[PDB]
Amino acid sequence: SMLDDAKARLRKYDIGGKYSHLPYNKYSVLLPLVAKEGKLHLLFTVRSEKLRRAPGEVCFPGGKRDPTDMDDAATALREAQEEVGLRPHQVEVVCCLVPCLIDTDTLITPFVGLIDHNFQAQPNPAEVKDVFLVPLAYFLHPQVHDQINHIFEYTNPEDGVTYQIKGMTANLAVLVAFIILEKKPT
Ligand SMILES: O=C(Cc1cccc(O)c1)Nc1cccc(Cl)c1
Structure with a gap:
């Protein structure tokens, strides 16, 4: 199946907890895969304009590790719940990608x-x-604008709204698209 195939692909890139104990300032992000209309999608957030860091920018749910977190995956899930109401039973964490x-x-x-x-x-x-x-699949053929660094512009066909996706967020989206969608029969 589409989902079993995606998970099997993802697991091959899992680094697990290899880098997790290193003494850094630690943040986790959740790259949330949603299946709709027979295709996989990534879920993104637009940060509130009230925030100090990067107001109005597109990014994945996540945040800084705190002492309650059992592990780095827990950070991602706790923050995603706070930010978008995603409950842990609503998410299957498949792997940890390159930090x-x-x-x-x-x-x-x-x-x-x-x-x-x-x-x-x-x-x-x-x-x-x-x-x-x-x-x-958008991330295989994005609409690129140069600001010099590459910015993706995605227009939602449902409503015509254009979002800019850049930096780490754009990079991670492409990585996931490559992992899951490369070398597939039609
Ligand atoms: O803070 C994050 C995760 C994160 C961490 C580091 C870099 C990065 O792009 C995203 N995500 C988020 C998304 C929306 C609102 C708020 Cl308050 C936070």
Whole structure:
């Protein structure tokens, strides 16, 4: 099946807890995969304009590890719940992808999660301005704009709204698209 095939692909790239005990400032992100209309999608958030860091920008759910978290996957799930109302029973964490080093002292660990088909986002408006899906295949043929660094522009055909996706968020989206969609018969 589509989902069993995606999970099997993802597991081959799992680094697990290899880098998890290193003494960094630690954040986790959830790369949430949603199956709709017979295709896989990634779920993104638009950060509230009220936030200090990166107001109005597109990013994955997640946040800073806190002492309650059993592990880095727990960070991602706790923060996703706070931000978009995703409950742990609504997500199957499939793997941990390559962590992202930033600012010399920070390590961001991405987890890919399969999201229940009945999930409907309940965003905290203090943190999240918007939630939207992008088909995973978009990231194989994105609409690229140069700002010099590459920015993706995705227009939702449901409503004509264009979102800019860039940086780590764009990079991770492409990675997941490659992992899951490469070398597939039609
Ligand atoms: O903070 C994150 C995870 C995260 C961490 C580090 C970098 C990055 O792009 C995303 N995500 C989020 C998304 C919406 C609102 C709020 Cl309040 C936070």
